[PDB]
Amino acid sequence: KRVAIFASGSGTNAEAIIQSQKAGQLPCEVALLITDKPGAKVVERVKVHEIPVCALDPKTYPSKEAYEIEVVQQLKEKQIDFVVLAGYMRLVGPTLLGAYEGRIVNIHPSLLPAFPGLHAIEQAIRANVKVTGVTIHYVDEGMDTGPIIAQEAVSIEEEDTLETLTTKIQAVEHRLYPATLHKLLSKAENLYFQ
Amino acid sequence: KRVAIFASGSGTNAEAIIQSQKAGQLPCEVALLITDKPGAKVVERVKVHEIPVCALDPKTYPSKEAYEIEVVQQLKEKQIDFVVLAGYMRLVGPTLLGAYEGRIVNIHPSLLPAFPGLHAIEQAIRANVKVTGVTIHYVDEGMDTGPIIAQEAVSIEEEDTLETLTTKIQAVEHRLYPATLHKLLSKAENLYFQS
């Protein structure tokens, strides 16, 4: 029962998922990290668990399709059953989606459909909303589109800044992503690991 | 200290605001209802408090501007200081906005900017979101635009239907609209009711 994670930068969501496996809550094993650069905390955090990492810079490839062909090659090689995006900053193209349709999920720091795309916490602050939150969803063709699995609201208090709100939102993500993955990939159904 | 309410249909939000006045929580008095149809529960609910009612069918006017000119006339006639939209289903045009800019608020049953416009509770169910909610905001030019004053989230449970979610959202509106109006229009500031 193998999961791949796509992540970059700090990798705190990837860490919470790995911690959830160690707790006995995730009903699968993290088997691969796909990332953009070697010199990042997420690589360090994952490497110490002896989980394979494939660091593919997308700009090295002639096209998005060529990059995704290599991505899919890696997922197939590691016998990946499910794909978890955890701070993956690119759109998922037709090659990746075609190979893993119905088996890719994502987390996004807004209540979709509000504030899709990059820097959604900053978007909510700039729009002066009073409530934002976190969305976990299946990945389909478009930007942050696909059937929504879970959402949780977070209030923006008057004293909140980008930093303090980001902390609150990350706390929700670290609890919610693994709890949602546990419920979704429950051993009751054999669904994704047949 | 006079407020006008714009409402149609059942008028349950209008009722909650009147009730909050009667409770001692609203620091102003409801002085006028502007509505579209005489034969509605909101008219009945408001009339029994002997609050003046102006029923203006907008379709019986040459233009949106002509209708709003009459609206503004009625508001000026009644010495209205603040305008509360409570199920007003038309866009606020330049005539109304020009006369009462900064003194019009609205309630909307989604977490703006998601699901602006009509039937937003149905929109959220059709979009299969798991969280929706309520927004109270100042009214500017445009549809459901303007500085957001308050929001409250409501979870859509698996067993929720349009009917049961609507009940939940209306419960939030009936508490939140008057509580927000109390905070916004607080006596300490006396911002909107200067002589």
Q: How far apart are CA A44 and CA A10, in angstroms?
A: 9
Shortest CA gap B159–chain A (Å): 15
Q: How far apart are CA A28 and CA B22, in angstroms?
A: 59
Chain A residues in contact with B169 (beta carbon < 8 A): none
User: Is A129's CB within 8 Å of B148's CB?
Assistant: yes
- In whole angstroms, how far apart are CA A75 and each of A31, A70, A164, B117? 9, 9, 36, 43
Shortest CA gap B135–chain A (Å): 9
Counted across chains A and B, CB pairs separated by less than 8 A come out at: 48
Show the tokens assigned to A91.
Answer: 């759109």
User: Is A148's CB within 8 Å of B128's CB?
Assistant: yes
Give the mutation candidate from A108, A131, A184 for the B interface (greatest B CB count, under 10 A): A131
Instruction: Answer left, alpha or beta for residue B146, where phi above 0 means left and psi between -120 and 50 means alpha.
Output: left
Q: Please indicate if any CB of chain A lies within 8 Å of the CB of B131.
A: yes
Q: Please indicate if any CB of chain A lies within 8 Å of the CB of B127.
A: yes
Give the mutation candidate from B111, B132, B137, B176 for the A interface (greatest A CB count, under 10 A): B111
Task: Name the CA radius of gyration of chain B, rounded.
Answer: 16
User: Is B131's CB within 8 Å of A112's CB?
Assistant: no
Instruction: Identify whether the C-beta of residue A141 lies closer than 8 Å to the C-beta of residue A102.
Output: no
Q: How far apart are CA B180 and CA B84, in angstroms?
A: 12
Domains present along chain A, CATH in parentheses: 1-194 (3.40.50.170)
Q: Count the Cβ atoms, other than its own, within 10 Å of residue A39.
A: 7
Which distant-in-sequence residues (6+ apart) come within 8 Å of A32 by Cβ? A2, A4, A5, A51, A52, A53, A54, A74, A75, A78, A80
Tracing tokens 């349009």 back to the chain, one arrives at: B162
> Per residue, what are the HEC states of chain B?
CEEEEECCCCCHHHHHHHHHHHCCCCCCEEEEEEECCCCCHHHHHHHCCCCCEEECCHHHCCCHHHHHHHHHHHHHHCCCCEEEECCCCCCCCHHHHHHHCCCEEEEECCCCCCCCCCCHHHHHHHCCCCEEEEEEEECCCCCCCCCEEEEEEEECCCCCCHHHHHHHHHHHHHHHHHHHHHHHCCCCCCCCCCC
Show the tokens assigned to B10.
Answer: 């059942």
User: Is A150's CB within 8 Å of B129's CB?
Assistant: no
For A60, which DSSP code?
G
